Subunit: 109 residues, 3 copies
């Protein structure tokens, strides 16, 4: 679809970027988006305020899709462009995240 | 475009979800979005706050398109996710909503 | 990607609609988004506040894409719907704007 996967990623990103300080509820609040094949026990709140999110396309993978978003994230005191990448897999109506997302510096240059 | 229907729907939703307590003004603020073929005299403010809107795709009808959005709707401080569906039809210069939107519970899993 | 031109255009619009009153700084902050072949020596802050941006689709050109967005701009606290059109060309690494954006009045009717 594209829309569907896009939207799904945005919802996941809302919880992934949550600032809940207690690691247990943080994981619990994002459990539903992440496949059981992934161990989220070491994921915690990332210390980063999500200021904007834009869908940056998908690439077909073997079992699903790799998706990208462009983000403005604020940390410490400064605001910068990142890309976030993660894989998803379709489920019987719906989606699941299947890798830990990678955050990297990005520019259009 | 897929984009143009998307954008049109977002605009309509802003008015559809408006909290105007006077049912006359509520209807007239959305009149231009909705086809004259549709009777909006019982539409009123829904008491819900729209916290977020994501385009969820369309599919063709004989006459136009059935569009879906995923919404975050809030009452008394708490949000839940819903799908909203409604039909649109192209007009010479734009688009019109041609059915009363259907608002339904939704989840990814 | 359609996604990618869309997002690029959003980032550009943020700088293009910046209200920076120093002409050299307004130009510098948007420099990387615009092709060097465009004369940006006379672009100034437009005195308009950008309340919302929705992607409105693209149209292939000889070397790129003509993109459109629907905007809510605010001038005095008087808000209105506008459309903005400009062209964009890929670069091996990303994208560049290649025309000066056209802003025009818009409605769905």
């Amino acid at each position: 679809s594209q829309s569907k996967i896009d939207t799904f990623g945005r919802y996941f990103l809302t919880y992934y970027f949550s600032q809940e300080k207690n690691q247990e509820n943080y994981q619990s609040s994002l459990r539903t988006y992440v496949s059981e094949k992934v161990d989220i026990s070491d994921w915690k709140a990332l210390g980063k305020t999500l200021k904007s999110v834009n869908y940056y396309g998908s690439e077909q993978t073997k079992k699903g899709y790799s998706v990208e978003y462009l983000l403005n994230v604020s940390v410490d005191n400064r605001s910068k462009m990142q890309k976030i990448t993660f894989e998803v897999e379709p489920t019987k109506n719906g989606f699941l995240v299947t890798t830990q997302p990678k955050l990297t510096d990005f520019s259009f240059n």
